[PDB]
Structure 1
Amino acid sequence: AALPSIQLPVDYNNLFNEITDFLVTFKQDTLSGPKYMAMLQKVANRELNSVIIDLDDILQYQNEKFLQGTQADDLVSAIQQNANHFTELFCRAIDNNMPLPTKEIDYKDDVLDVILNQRRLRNERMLSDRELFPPNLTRRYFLYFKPLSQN
């Protein structure tokens, strides 16, 4: 069963780069690390199981970038239009960027760590001539889009 195909005003390689740049750059500086990298550090320490993405933050990031003169492709409008796909994109950006824990958590009692460690040992033996998993399995957090505030 064949399908026709069309062009659309979106590019997910570009928007993936926009998302990860946002994720490592933004902070609420008017309130005086990057907000989301700090929150991902809290996820790494397993103290927090939810990542709350603010569309307000994406707006302020867009406004900063537009004030610096670059186009920003209005990621807020894009991820209000097709939010389901962008949960996957934001999780890929997080699963790339997320730092190591600063605090120890008695890691050996985690089954998923043990089972994928055993897999890695076996795969090292295989690769020594003697992705590793589906990403959702290793993704402990849950990701949510918080709406735009009225302004």
Structure 2
Amino acid sequence: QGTQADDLVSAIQQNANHFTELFCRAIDNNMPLPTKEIDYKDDVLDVILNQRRLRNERMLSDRTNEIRSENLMDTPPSSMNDALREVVEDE
């Protein structure tokens, strides 16, 4: 196509150990949602992972609600949401 692309294959062949978690981070960045719901015929590690993801979502929602209910400045909605998300994800 003419665009410039780095030699990812040689970089993998030289330093594959770092590229393992690089691929893992990229895969977790765009992970599709499961079509089938979880059930009783499902693995124990899988239900643990589902509970961990739901628990993380509950932490994020609860901290967002507490910080928004504090109402520090009482005042740009999108920038406010971005800053609140960043402070929630860092705290």
With the length of structure 1 as denominator, give the TM-score of the two structures: 0.30
Q: Please list every run of 5 or more consecutive structure 2 residues that lacks an aligned counterpart in the other structure.
A: 82-91
- Tell me the secondary structure at the aligned position of residue 120 of structure 1: helix
Asked which structure has the greater CA Rg, the reply is 2
Indicate the structure whose relative CO is greater, using CA pairs within 8 Å and at least 6 residues apart. Answer: 1
Paired with 1:115 and 1:76, the residues of 2 have a C-alpha distance of 35
Structure number with higher strand proportion? 1
Q: 1:111 offset after TM fit, Å? A: 3.9
Distance 2:62 2:80 in 1: 60
Higher helix proportion (structure 1 or 2):
2
Report how far residue 105 of structure 1 moved: 4.8
Deviation string for 1:53-104 (max 9, x for gaps)? xxxxxxxxxxxxxxx1111111011111100100110011111112122334
Percent of aligned positions that are identical = 92
- Matched-pair contact (CA < 8 Å) for 2:38–2:47: no
| Distance (whole Å) between structure 2 residues aligned to residue 133 and residue 113 of structure 1 | 33
Residues 79 and 86 of structure 1 are in contact (CA less than 8 Å); yes or no, is this contact kept in structure 2? yes
Q: 1:92 to 1:107 in 2, by over 3 A?
A: farther
Contact 1:108 1:114 survives alignment (8 Å): no
Q: Deviations over 1:107-132 (max 9, x none)?
A: 68544455566667777776677999
In structure 2, do the counterparts of structure 1 residues 112 and 98 end up closer, same or farther at CA, with 3 Å as the change threshold? same
- Aligned-residue Cα RMSD (Å) equals 15.2
Question: Partners of 1:125 and 1:104 in 2: how far apart?
Answer: 19
- For normalisation by structure 2, the TM-score amounts to 0.45
Q: Is the alpha carbon distance of 1:106 and 1:70 closer, same or farther for their aligned partners in structure 2, counting shifts above 3 Å? A: same
